[PDB]
Design an enzyme around this catalytic site. Structure first.
Site, short mmCIF file in Angstrom:
data_model
loop_
_atom_site.label_atom_id
_atom_site.label_comp_id
_atom_site.label_asym_id
_atom_site.label_seq_id
_atom_site.Cartn_x
_atom_site.Cartn_y
_atom_site.Cartn_z
NE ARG A 179 -2.86 2.69 3.10
CZ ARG A 179 -2.62 3.33 4.23
NH1 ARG A 179 -1.88 2.78 5.18
NH2 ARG A 179 -3.11 4.56 4.41
N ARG B 208 -6.27 19.50 6.77
CA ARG B 208 -5.05 18.98 7.36
C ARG B 208 -4.09 20.11 7.69
CE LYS C 171 -8.71 4.90 3.64
NZ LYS C 171 -7.61 5.91 3.70
CB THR D 114 -7.76 2.39 11.35
OG1 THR D 114 -9.08 1.94 11.63
CG2 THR D 114 -7.84 3.24 10.09
#
Lengths: 499, 130
Positions: free
Chosen positions: A49, A90, A238, A296
């Site tokens: 990944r 972010r 996701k 996660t």
């Protein structure tokens, strides 16, 4: 019944299962070397990944080139997955990497690129330009997953705000923001996000993990960006917020697989809920016969310790029991002190869980939900697993060139390896995220055109035998396509392996 | 998959002592098992006999067992960080003269049945003369 199977378990008896689940590893500072990747691959890694919330295209070219080379060396087919930055207020790059804030402290919050990395306890930078125009004095700014909260006190400047610190916290570079008011209208693919996807199509990645997918129309947006040069690459939505969970049905339909970003979910929904959300999302994915990944917080504390916690292990086991096709490490493998050990802990968890589930119950369940008349295609793969169970087969060998067939055959959750014999490499690579499948490449250019489909069947059976699946007098289950069909496989054959 | 490598044999005096060492490599990549995940057994084969149990150790060393003949005289331990098993043999007697093998089972628990182990070392001679 599981109840029977459970009372039949012995901790002392060795387990026999050939691993059915697939392990997804994130590459990073401690696993990017070819020798390290080779250790990941030997230790069970099926997809590497590329987390693009970080690094330059040069770091990520190094990873592509290095897994391909490590793969080649091993003669394996490893997938490559480009995880996107995603839309995400972010903020970080702190001066000295960090800053600590006490309750009662006043701190500037600026959208001026001048402080984009000289971010201090007193003045730091938030990526969203519309912050002064979307957050008013009084409301809160959730910083680093609902942990650090700031009360707005004034629009001090044109693009800066003066905020009141509620709780103490230590902020490290690049922490995500979770502005509690919606109408932030956040895009599906940021301008970087796009540009990172042509770079992925241009380098031939096998799958995108599209990030912060909320609605089905976004999964369309991702698609269109991939282009026609990338019409054939997988999109894995996701699911990481309540909107994803909310529209999980039309997201599943329009995606190719689903990843459950458990931690990201738990910012917005309770832990006890997240548990349910995973049962739910995974199972819907089972029924749709689409690949589902747990994400996660897997074996987190084995990022610095040589062993994870018992609770974290029953956590991974549950994701398997729950029906996950894959588990994904991240940081355990990307920044961690034990990557090969964690990946080998994941193999041992899967096999033990696999070993611990009744072999049939998923089949029966997924079968008893199918509407009748089934379609031919559905019935063919259904009856395959069914026959295999009935005759006690040691491997299903499907010949599928896109692999749709293997995902159908795995949707019935057999109790034996699926050996997919494909004439496409992409298919070898992409099938890595589907339970029990193991691909085998038929290089047509190298060999015959194999219209009698005979060479390909030997290929699959040779493998099954060398891989230890099947041995003289074992019965195998061949699922291919007849010479008179548009696409799809409609032919099935029950062979016996001959010495 | 996993290979074991013996060392430490030889001739010793009645009442003397040796420390057998077993070093481990590879992995069973298929099972994700390594030396540190697997129990280890020590077996000895006296001249013309089959290969009987001496002692065993669980995966993380938390459990060991010994044949009564070596109890109080032998000790099995393991350093999973160095990938090594040890057999410490004290007050050696002429009756301990045998070839000694270490063997690794693909289970966290050990056994006393030779056929239950998956990989062995080549074995080392131990001869105790008085």
């Amino acid at each position: 019944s599981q109840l029977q199977h459970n009372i039949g378990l012995s901790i002392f008896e060795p387990v026999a299962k050939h691993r059915a689940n697939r392990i997804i590893c994130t590459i990073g500072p401690s696993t990017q070397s070819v020798e390290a990747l080779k250790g990941l691959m030997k230790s069970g890694m099926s997809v590497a990944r590329m987390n693009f919330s970080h690094g330059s295209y040069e770091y990520h070219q190094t990873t592509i080139n290095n897994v391909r080379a490590a793969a080649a060396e091993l003669g394996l087919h490893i997938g490559i997955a480009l995880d996107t930055k995603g839309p995400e207020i972010r903020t970080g790059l702190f001066k000295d990497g960090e800053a600590t804030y006490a309750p009662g402290d006043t701190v500037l919050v600026t959208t001026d690129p001048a402080f984009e990395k000289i971010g201090t306890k007193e003045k730091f930078y938030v990526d969203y330009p519309q912050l002064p125009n979307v957050v008013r004095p009084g409301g809160l700014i959730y910083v680093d997953d609902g942990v650090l909260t700031l009360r707005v006190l004034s629009k001090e400047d044109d693009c800066t705000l003066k905020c009141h610190v509620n709780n103490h916290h230590r902020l490290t570079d690049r922490k995500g923001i979770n502005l509690p008011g919606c109408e932030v209208d956040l895009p599906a693919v940021s301008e970087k996000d796009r540009k990172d996807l042509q770079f992925g199509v241009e380098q031939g990645v096998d799958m995108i993990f599209a990030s912060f997918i909320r609605t089905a129309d976004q999964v369309r947006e991702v698609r269109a960006a991939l282009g026609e040069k990338g019409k054939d690459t997988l999109i894995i939505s996701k699911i990481e917020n309540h909107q994803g969970v909310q529209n999980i049905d039309a997201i599943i339909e329009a995606s190719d697989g689903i990843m459950v970003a458990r931690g990201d979910l738990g910012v917005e929904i309770p832990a006890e809920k997240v548990v349910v959300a995973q049962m739910c999302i995974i199972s819907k994915c089972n029924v749709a016969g689409k690949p589902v990944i747990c994400a996660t917080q897997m074996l987190e504390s084995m990022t610095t310790n040589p062993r994870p916690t018992r609770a974290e292990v029953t956590d991974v086991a549950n994701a398997v029991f729950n029906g996950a096709d894959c588990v994904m490490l991240s940081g355990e493998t990307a920044k961690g002190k034990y990557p090969n050990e964690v990946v080998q802990y994941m193999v041992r968890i899967c096999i033990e869980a696999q070993s611990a589930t009744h072999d049939s119950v998923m089949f029966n369940s997924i079968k008893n939900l199918q509407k009748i008349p089934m379609s031919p295609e559905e019935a063919v793969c259904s009856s395959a697993v069914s026959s295999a169970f009935e005759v006690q087969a040691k491997a299903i060998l499907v010949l599928s060139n896109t692999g749709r067939s293997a995902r159908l055959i795995s949707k019935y959750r057999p109790n034996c390896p699926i050996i997919c014999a494909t004439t496409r490499l992409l298919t070898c690579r992409q099938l890595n995220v589907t339970r029990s499948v193991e691909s085998v490449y038929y290089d047509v250019d190298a060999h015959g055109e194999d219209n009698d489909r005979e060479k390909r069947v030997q290929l699959g059976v040779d493998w099954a035998k060398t891989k230890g699946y099947v041995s003289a007098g074992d019965v195998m289950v061949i699922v291919h396509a007849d010479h008179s069909v548009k696409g799809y496989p409609n032919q099935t054959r029950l062979v016996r392996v001959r010495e | 998959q996993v290979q074991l490598q013996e060392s430490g044999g030889g001739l010793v005096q009645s009442g003397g002592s040796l420390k057998l060492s077993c070093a481990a490599s590879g992995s069973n990549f298929s099972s994700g098992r390594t030396f540190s995940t697997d129990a280890i057994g020590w077996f000895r084969q006296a001249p013309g006999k089959e290969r009987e149990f001496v002692g065993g150790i669980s995966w993380n060393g938390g459990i060991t067992d010994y044949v009564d003949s070596v109890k109080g005289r032998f000790t099995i331990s393991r350093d999973n960080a160095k990938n090594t098993v040890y057999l410490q043999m004290n007050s050696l007697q002429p009756e301990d003269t045998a070839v000694y093998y270490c063997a690794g089972r693909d289970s966290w628990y050990f056994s006393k049945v030779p056929d239950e182990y998956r990989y062995w070392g080549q074995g080392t001679q131990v001869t105790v003369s008085s």
